[PDB]
Design a protein around this ligand. Sequence first.
Ligand SMILES: CN(C(=O)Cc1cccc(Cl)c1)c1cncc2ccccc12
Ligand SMILES: CN(C(=O)Cc1cccc(Cl)c1)c1cncc2ccccc12
Lengths: 304, 304
Amino acid sequence: SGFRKMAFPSGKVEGCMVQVTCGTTTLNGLWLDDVVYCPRHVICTSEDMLNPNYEDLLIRKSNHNFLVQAGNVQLRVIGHSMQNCVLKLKVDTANPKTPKYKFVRIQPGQTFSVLACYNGSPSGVYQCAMRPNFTIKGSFLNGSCGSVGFNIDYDCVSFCYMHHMELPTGVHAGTDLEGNFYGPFVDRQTAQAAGTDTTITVNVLAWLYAAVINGDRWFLNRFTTTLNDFNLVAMKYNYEPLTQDHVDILGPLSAQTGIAVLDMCASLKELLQNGMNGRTILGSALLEDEFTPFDVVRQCSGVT
Amino acid sequence: SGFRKMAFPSGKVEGCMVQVTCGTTTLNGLWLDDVVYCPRHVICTSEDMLNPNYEDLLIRKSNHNFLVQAGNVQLRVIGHSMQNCVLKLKVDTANPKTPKYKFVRIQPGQTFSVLACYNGSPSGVYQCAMRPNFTIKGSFLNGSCGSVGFNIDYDCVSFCYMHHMELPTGVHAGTDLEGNFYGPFVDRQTAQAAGTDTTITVNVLAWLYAAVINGDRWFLNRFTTTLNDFNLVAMKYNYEPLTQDHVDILGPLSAQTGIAVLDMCASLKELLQNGMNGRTILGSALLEDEFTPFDVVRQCSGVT
Ligand SMILES: CN(C(=O)Cc1cccc(Cl)c1)c1cncc2ccccc12
Ligand SMILES: CN(C(=O)Cc1cccc(Cl)c1)c1cncc2ccccc12
């Protein structure tokens, strides 16, 4: 019993972290096989960040300008290339600690763990969701760029995020491991609109199922609703509209609890219209949307 | 910016996890140097747990009855001894992945990370606090016994908790690494009173300082209070009384923000008396007490 915002064990990722330095800028890199991946803005000075011409900036750099250090040992850089907003530094040594891995582009509303790093050294691990507006509400300070987000399935690490930037609003933006930003962001020091965010409806429903499994049941009511009726409410409260694809992924939780998905939607509808009345659900006084249906089943039934 | 319930990177601990099996019972063990540590109830069957005579049960066991497997490789057990509620299985091989470590008994109100494990395999990591009543509000299923709690300071893992039991109320109890339970608990299947819990006042104040550092400031008011006045309020709301030792550990956060500790106590006093009025602080609608003053400074200013 109990329900926590749980991250994947970070060991497999810790073994991949390196420090990358170019000129006077230092950030984190990810060393997998014989390639180190890092944000391309490692080649910028503060003066360059207003509007960097990354192609021109990178032309001034040679392999020997990228200093890559794995703990205390130095990696020899034998090639460099820019792919979208990431640099890929070919090194002469395959990382002996490379886990089985994949690069994936996650969908908005999915979750992942972040290993925050500074100077190539891991500092902490936390779980978060990719917001519907493609920002993440992380915890990152200067020096965290190049930290990565990931999911783990048995022995395979699926890397989905590399941290690049903190927006003026304090939320975070980054790329997949091919250097493509999530969302409309560009790697330059300008104010950039994130756009309207929404609450991840299917995750709130998943977490209400987690609450019932863990014994918090005060919010279950005698009502039901339809997808159309529930979606009128979701619109009013800035929640994502629920689709049959979301109902389908909630099937396992619906079977575990015996609570039909539309009956749980009626409980969520009443919580949205009445609030929590000073009560709590799984130690929260707000409706939580950072647990997917897969996360809930993994945490409530077991997976290692 | 941002503020998350961050755990230490778990890699150093993942390397220590093993599976321990005795008869038909399997749980987790911690392999440090040439010793594996695990809950002594690995020697019990379900019939024994009502009131086990651990001494008599252990006398029936020999070294060859404890099966210890580190991933896929088997460890040879060459000695066994019970210390309080833990077993210590001497093995013929020092764990090559043993990090620098210490065993510490944490104080109530302190925090630590938990690496939840099943069958010696790490499944997730989360941060939590040792409650003032010596329980932890973890997330653990059957098979999680032997999972450990820890803190990391640079390269040293300080192990503070080993998971033993879930109480009928769904909260958790365990021991230090010398097998001494935190709190009044005994390792037997009986209903056991945890006793009145309280909110960790100094951590709530630390988290209000984290909120101000991150830009959530709506709760700052034009008031101040005294320790005596604040403590009348803390009593009414079941918070721990604040002492000068707590004020002293809040000094760094008070200097960082320029907000005198007693002025922050007046903000906490008003939040306790008026509630949050439908507002949030650091994405929470409740007052958070699982961040110590050390945690806040580590997360807001940096430490790897
Ligand atoms: C280094 N950094 C940047 O945003 C730098 C940057 C500025 C502009 C564009 C890009 Cl692509 C990168 C940061 C990242 N995360 C969190 C930060 C907290 C405080 C200070 C800077 C933080
Ligand atoms: C295995 N276990 C025990 O409490 C066993 C036990 C029972 C009685 C006393 C002791 Cl010392 C141990 C558990 C631990 N954590 C969480 C649990 C969730 C569900 C089912 C059991 C869980």
